[PDB]
Symmetry: D3
Amino acid sequence: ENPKYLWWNHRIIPWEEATVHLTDYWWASVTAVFEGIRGYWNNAEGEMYIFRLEDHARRLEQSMQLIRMPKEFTVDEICQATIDLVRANDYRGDVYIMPLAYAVGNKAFSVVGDRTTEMFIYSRPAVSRLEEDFSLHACYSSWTRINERVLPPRIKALANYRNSQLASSEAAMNGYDTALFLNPEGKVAEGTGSCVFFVRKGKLITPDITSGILESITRDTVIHLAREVLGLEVEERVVDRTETYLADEAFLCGTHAEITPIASIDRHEMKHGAPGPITRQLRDIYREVVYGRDFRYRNWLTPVGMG
Amino acid sequence: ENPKYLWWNHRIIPWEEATVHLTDYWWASVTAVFEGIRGYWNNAEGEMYIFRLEDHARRLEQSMQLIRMPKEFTVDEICQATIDLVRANDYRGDVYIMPLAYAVGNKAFSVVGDRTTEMFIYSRPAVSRLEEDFSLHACYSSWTRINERVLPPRIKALANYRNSQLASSEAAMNGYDTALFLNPEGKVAEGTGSCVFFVRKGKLITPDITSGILESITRDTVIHLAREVLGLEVEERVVDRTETYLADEAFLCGTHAEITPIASIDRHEMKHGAPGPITRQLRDIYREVVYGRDFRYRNWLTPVGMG
Amino acid sequence: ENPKYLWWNHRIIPWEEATVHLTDYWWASVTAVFEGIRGYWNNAEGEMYIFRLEDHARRLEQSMQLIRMPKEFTVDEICQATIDLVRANDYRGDVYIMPLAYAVGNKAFSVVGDRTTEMFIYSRPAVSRLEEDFSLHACYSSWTRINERVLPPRIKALANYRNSQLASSEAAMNGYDTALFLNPEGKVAEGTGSCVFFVRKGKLITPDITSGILESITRDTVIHLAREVLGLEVEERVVDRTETYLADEAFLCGTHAEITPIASIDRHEMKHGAPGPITRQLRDIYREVVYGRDFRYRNWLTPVGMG
Amino acid sequence: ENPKYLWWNHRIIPWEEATVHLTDYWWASVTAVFEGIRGYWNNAEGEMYIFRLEDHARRLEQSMQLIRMPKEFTVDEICQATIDLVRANDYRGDVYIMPLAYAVGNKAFSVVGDRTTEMFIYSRPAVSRLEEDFSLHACYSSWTRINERVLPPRIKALANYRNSQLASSEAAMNGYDTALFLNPEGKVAEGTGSCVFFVRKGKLITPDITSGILESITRDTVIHLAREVLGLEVEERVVDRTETYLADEAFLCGTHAEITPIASIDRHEMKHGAPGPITRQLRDIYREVVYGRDFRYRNWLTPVGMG
Amino acid sequence: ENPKYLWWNHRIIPWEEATVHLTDYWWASVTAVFEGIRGYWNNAEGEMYIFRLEDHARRLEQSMQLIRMPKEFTVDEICQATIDLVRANDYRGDVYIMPLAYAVGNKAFSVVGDRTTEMFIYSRPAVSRLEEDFSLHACYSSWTRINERVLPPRIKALANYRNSQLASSEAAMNGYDTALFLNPEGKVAEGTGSCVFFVRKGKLITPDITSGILESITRDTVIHLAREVLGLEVEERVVDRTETYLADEAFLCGTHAEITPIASIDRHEMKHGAPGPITRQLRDIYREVVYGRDFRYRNWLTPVGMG
Amino acid sequence: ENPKYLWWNHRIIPWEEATVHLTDYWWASVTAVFEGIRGYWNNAEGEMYIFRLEDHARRLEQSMQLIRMPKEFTVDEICQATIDLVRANDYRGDVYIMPLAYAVGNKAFSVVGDRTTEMFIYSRPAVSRLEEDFSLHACYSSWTRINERVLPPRIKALANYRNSQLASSEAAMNGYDTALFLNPEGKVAEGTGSCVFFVRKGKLITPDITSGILESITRDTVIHLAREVLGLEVEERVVDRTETYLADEAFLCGTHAEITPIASIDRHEMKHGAPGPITRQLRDIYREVVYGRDFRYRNWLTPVGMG
Ligand SMILES: Cc1ncc(COP(=O)(O)O)c(CN)c1O
Ligand SMILES: Cc1ncc(COP(=O)(O)O)c(CN)c1O
Ligand SMILES: Cc1ncc(COP(=O)(O)O)c(CN)c1O
Ligand SMILES: Cc1ncc(COP(=O)(O)O)c(CN)c1O
Ligand SMILES: Cc1ncc(COP(=O)(O)O)c(CN)c1O
Ligand SMILES: Cc1ncc(COP(=O)(O)O)c(CN)c1O
Ligand SMILES: [Cl-]
Ligand SMILES: [Cl-]
Ligand SMILES: [Cl-]
Ligand SMILES: [Cl-]
Ligand SMILES: [Cl-]
Ligand SMILES: [Cl-]
Ligand SMILES: [Cl-]
Ligand SMILES: [Cl-]
Ligand SMILES: [Cl-]
Ligand SMILES: [Cl-]
Ligand SMILES: [Cl-]
Ligand SMILES: [Cl-]
Ligand SMILES: [Cl-]
Ligand SMILES: [Cl-]
Ligand SMILES: [Cl-]
Ligand SMILES: [Cl-]
Ligand SMILES: [Cl-]
Ligand SMILES: [Cl-]
Ligand SMILES: [Cl-]
Ligand SMILES: [Cl-]
Ligand SMILES: [Cl-]
Ligand SMILES: [Cl-]
Ligand SMILES: [Cl-]
Ligand SMILES: [Cl-]
Ligand SMILES: [Cl-]
Ligand SMILES: [Cl-]
Ligand SMILES: [Cl-]
Ligand SMILES: [Cl-]
Ligand SMILES: [Cl-]
Ligand SMILES: [Cl-]
């Protein structure tokens, strides 16, 4: 049913001890920021590898700074709590870990810095699809992405996802698997829960960070692997809607989404299939990295030996 | 400490029975919509008057429709639950009532229509300031209001308030009481938790609804009272920033905020004071209406006799 | 197969005489403007009624002025040619008439005033659906309406319809009957080939002309009939996307489209059905006007007696 | 008068056989896309060189995909038809070739994918000005360029040219030779029928493709020649209006326009003349390439031996 | 050569006494705001009539408040100084009066409230053209009007006129008499030194104040006279570019410009001439008002008897 | 009190001879453009070093060209006049020099090319803070930066500073030292009188020139020194608001401002202090360059030997 433990406000506690009142956190949720972190289980080594844990912890501390949450937790404490929780839950398999920080008050929605900062970390089993060949059909949404003027997409805020839900609900009702956003200027931004890459003429293209997107750690990883392992040109730039319709390949990338091939965009089929040849290479390389089977990228992994 | 009861998913329950898990509602909160409703206690009559309850219930049903929450609760059930909760709590004094609806799943942030719709209603004591002469100093925020392109302000969504908090935190750190927003086109919108009115040359001016604001019930009330009781001209129109600096009077209006006079905007003082003469008249008329002391507007009140 | 005649460059000619070269008009088409005009056949009177012919002729002369076509044809000549063509074709039934004006040169796409102005008028049988109860399911498009900055929608230019086709192709591939547009500011504009009306709380709402729409003659007609015959309030104003989801009724209006009820918008159902009660009244009144069965509006009709 | 032949729907036919009805293609023209291709005659070799034919054919297939025209013609068939038509016309001199594809139906303007795809190719004599020293006086237009939100400029659609004509008519009435566009954000885009380059401090500057321009093949050619033959720095970037007023040199480039020097922009004279020194070098190099007198760039030429 | 006197910092002084250093006011000019006021000489009465002096004085006090100039001068003092200067100059003829207020410091361009407020008033002969039938040819500028986001056009600031000069220089170099502006949204704003009115179908149309214009006193005057004397409908609303091309009449209005008919806009001729029939009526009525020959509007005039 | 001399219209004159009338230059100021130039006194060498004089003179000639001032002064004459004035004033200490050019007429605000071009140069003592460790607290303004659509920020126009003053007055009233601007798209632009740099992860970031900023000579200098002396990566790119809150260091740069460290931005503290380590290095290197103590950059200095 539930994991054995969670982490909450500087301590590991049994799951059933984290009882609260229905009314306690609705106002707090408007302040909340979070991370998505994966642990990949290597049965041959008896080790969980938590992927880019310090980078995720640093981004959570940045998000919390941008919300104006008083300082309460450090990067090293978030890292250590994650390791301690994954070991104590004693689940030997792939996991998805969600640290979530919030400021509690004003049970009252419309100032953050007068509130107290709290955090929990919740680790649950989650399967990987990196051994599976699958693809999604995407649409561009009629709803525009949040931007720096109103709700900065650099901040990984729960509230941002209300805009994600406009797009993801439209995609589902209109017969698509997933939605991509345009920014207010009409340029390509990101997906509802991932960044997007395009392959054309043997090069990788992705919206630059100032297109109004999350600074995706899976995006950064893919840029490094594409340049370093495959020797590909990668362009971080402004990207137009119609050029993406002509892509040879496309894929989403994100911690939960891993590397998710895109078969079509607004019913324009990616010419080289899904996963196409370069996407297949990147998904296979990414898989060997996160499972601790590529020594070149060991510095990205935090091992948790579970004996 | 706490009210005796709350209402949750079609039943009144004792407060202490509404226990839940820490992890239960974070994803749900991204779907959530809510109302703010006041009950005003008339000790002479032994009656609570809930103000424009059906209008609030109808707006909540509209918000829930716009989020795409499956149909579960009706307008008549929301009204009746509110009456039943205010009576059962047996608190003979002014209250603030928050119905909050949410869709629960995907404990997973980035489709609503596959989720189940839930709701609670929480009524707590809240004082009125309508017998008090006070005023606030406002600033226009450096942060822009959400708009129809990204997060429609007609929908009373919890997530909208992340944008309110950008502005309200800036106002507090910059030495102001409260913030006003501009919309993306640079026109005046609303406050962080209220609509705004301006008085100039004996007429009332307020941003039109398509300026990108909540369709405030207190705004509608004030328009009716200004025209019907005081015989004033009221203009619902596009409003510019600099014209508001020259206002004779200004005020916020909202269910929680009631009628809150504004003394200055970006350190431009309202010429006729705060509350100025017309604001004083409207605050006094509004007070006599909501306490059940003006028979002309009885159709706005839901009485709860508490014997 | 084909009508007996058409009108071309100041004369009626037999259909088969209007032969031209494949290469003759591609460049000309970028300059072209047109009208849609209906003739309604009244078998009891032996008369075709051409609806608001002078208004259509005047708009065509305005469009041609805005394209900068040299003066060649007058309003009275367009009216007379239409009457002469409908009589000479000797088709006793409902028709749709398309005058189309173009400037020919530079067989060369990227100045109009150095070109010669030409025009034809093509009248063909077209059925009316005004005795039929039917409705369409609409979506708002991901593609934005043309605006005054780039391609003024007041000008009834053929080229405008490339933007209509972006939206109408998306609607069809996404399982809708018809598309509605937002303008660049995110406000409701028009349909791909019609204006749109909304009914809420017993009043009619339609985007104002400066929302970036054609100055629809069917729109003007409906405003007059709603105010004069039904006594309804009609608001020409800025209209938001989400308010239209809450409409009691909605309908398209246009010369070809007549009055076309809308059952839903982005899968939000119009509460009072389609045709709803007010839409039904307007469609029935409009039908009695255009068939010459309402003497109050005779001044809108041009009769062509066909003996 | 006319060329001997044209190509239409998979066959070469005598010119006089391509007769059609006046009414046949007006609706089709709203779907239409096209290319401009030059053939350069080398009398010493008895060979026509068609410049970058496969690149033009590929762009036409992309445009047709973006319009959603059913698949009917291939890249290899467009190339072969062009070669076959230039040879069969037996005109030994410079030509301009226009393939034009259209979808025919709905003789009815406001879905493409239900239509049948057709195409013709029209080759006519056209002189080169590459041995001539001439320059144009440009203005920036008061009319804004089409953008991805409304009418993507990557698609070489006939309808786009209605926006070109707003600008080119203004330039002519205001005493200029040619117009340049700003995009909606106010940045430099393209000319009405060409891309634009600027020379300042010995480097070449041109608007990046996401400024909202056609992906000009003459632009690509000029970038290659500037870097490879002249060793110049070339910057593809966002370009401001006022910086272009300070350019040392400027020029248009396009298939029909070739390399067309600009003497002034809004009556600011280019400091180094027109053609200035670098423009002269590029025009001379481009001329030697397209006439088959530079073996380094042979892979750009398709020779048609005409004996 | 020069007037006898000017007014400066609370006193009338002989002209030749207002000597200053070249370097004294360049930084001050960035803070400066001003008014334009006319005096009309009635030789039959021996009286100068200063038109709407208190309204001009009030707008200057508003401009100075918006710049944040410390309070130094009152409305009554500005009025009295104007009267005193026009009498002391002893010029019996039409005048144009410029009060100009500035804040002096930081001889240092990039805080106002730490500066001292100063003002002068300069009255000079200026002829009226209200007995003359003349018209101007206008263009819409390629340069956009200042808006509330960057430089509010309600404030009558000297610096605003740098944007006026972009447009007025373009008009002159492009062979027009005068320029009209579009605002950033592409809607009609104002002229470079006047507001604009359009006449179509017997009604008057003018951009609403929130289109981003000065709140012109001549505009207000014309609205009153059109409604009260002529019984015309006047619409203050958003106005589109292309509708103005179809106007029957058009005119500029402003204190210096008086009522200046517009013959054409971007070489579209106003159908009913310039001055057209309604413009002629308004110019004649305005003339009889400002010369003290219409008792209905005496309350607009400040008489200065000069014996 | 005052310097001995100034330069005006091709000649050096004693200060007291530059007397003018109060009314002479208000209209002229709307046309005016200027430069800020520093002279740094090296007592050991007996030499003033004027920093990048030719670059400043060239930018002034560009500004004057963009205003459309008739040609009157050359770059070499501006350079020589500056040298001649600094020597003749015989002030042996640090100076700030302001050339200011204006066009005089139409004493009449709303065409430049019909006016006569004039210029003065004013040199005054000004201290350097380059031996001082100090920092400023910045805010982002609620007022937007001027852009190419309305008032190009490349032109160093006096009128631009009205927009600077909106921001600098807000910063002062809101308890900050200095203001930073966003451009209309919401991206980081410049300060009110300087460009801005950010340091993060050991690299330098600054808004690209097309973000809507002055082409700062101190910015160019800092880019050269950072790359050439320190070997740092420098990124000229679009910059977001929230990324700047996370900067390790930040600083303003400009001729008057020199290198001015920023301690915080909207009350987000720069992690590595102010001046932080890289800022300290750049300020020290810049100081040794401008005082003639670094032979590598001698070509930037104009020496004036004062014996
Ligand atoms: C909106 C959005 N964008 C991008 C991503 C991908 O980010 P990361 O690779 O760091 O998981 C996510 C998932 N966190 C997301 O929710
Ligand atoms: C953003 C916002 N705007 C306006 C209002 C005022 O709305 P009402 O008068 O219906 O309470 C509120 C309070 N609900 C609000 O939060
Ligand atoms: C885009 C558009 N808008 C509106 C309309 C309706 O115009 P009318 O009622 O004049 O036919 C049409 C049909 N002409 C249209 O094509
Ligand atoms: C709008 C536009 N832009 C650019 C170009 C230049 O494109 P190319 O060099 O591929 O001819 C053209 C001519 N096809 C054009 O019409
Ligand atoms: C920009 C602008 N707009 C409008 C006007 C007209 O204003 P008024 O009628 O008050 O003179 C003027 C002249 N003051 C002006 O300069
Ligand atoms: C607005 C603005 N921006 C930037 C700068 C810095 O420019 P520079 O380094 O050339 O002095 C200045 C000072 N001239 C300025 O006023
Ligand atoms: Cl578990
Ligand atoms: Cl990398
Ligand atoms: Cl790379
Ligand atoms: Cl994730
Ligand atoms: Cl597909
Ligand atoms: Cl209680
Ligand atoms: Cl009312
Ligand atoms: Cl009213
Ligand atoms: Cl509330
Ligand atoms: Cl104040
Ligand atoms: Cl027929
Ligand atoms: Cl009507
Ligand atoms: Cl009405
Ligand atoms: Cl039609
Ligand atoms: Cl539905
Ligand atoms: Cl031929
Ligand atoms: Cl290259
Ligand atoms: Cl290069
Ligand atoms: Cl071409
Ligand atoms: Cl020139
Ligand atoms: Cl005088
Ligand atoms: Cl009035
Ligand atoms: Cl009226
Ligand atoms: Cl004036
Ligand atoms: Cl004309
Ligand atoms: Cl000195
Ligand atoms: Cl460099
Ligand atoms: Cl670098
Ligand atoms: Cl400076
Ligand atoms: Cl701080």
